[PDB]
Ligand binder design. Structure first.
Ligand code: FES
Ligand code: FES
Lengths: 63, 63
């Protein structure tokens, strides 16, 4: 049971790097692998959780 | 097909918040929902990807 059906399926391993000096006030990062704005959250987690009963959600990095 | 079988299954929605002033040099955050050090990566993604063919990996936040 894989988790990612959408993001860079050609890649062997998806690791994203961000510098704190690009966060601004705050940024929300996707942990559900469904965002169309990867690696940022775009709210797609909500439909996923409703359909599946899951409870996943983003990481908020703040300043 | 839910993604999270491990983290706070009582919770309706798992949103984590971190302040950049707690990153230090860098921190790696789990996006595979298998870490025993949630919300940080503990390398559990590697066994998951080997078993399933998946390609998920952490978010690295650096300074
Ligand atoms: S779109 Fe994936 S966690 Fe929000
Ligand atoms: S342990 Fe989950 S992304 Fe590394």
């Amino acid at each position: 049971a894989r988790c990612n059906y959408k993001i860079q399926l050609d890649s062997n391993k998806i690791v994203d790097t961000v510098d704190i000096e690009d966060i601004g006030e705050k940024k929300a990062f996707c942990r559900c692998w469904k965002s169309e704005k990867w690696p940022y959250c775009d709210g797609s987690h909500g439909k996923h959780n409703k359909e599946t009963g899951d409870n996943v959600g983003p990481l908020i990095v703040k300043s």
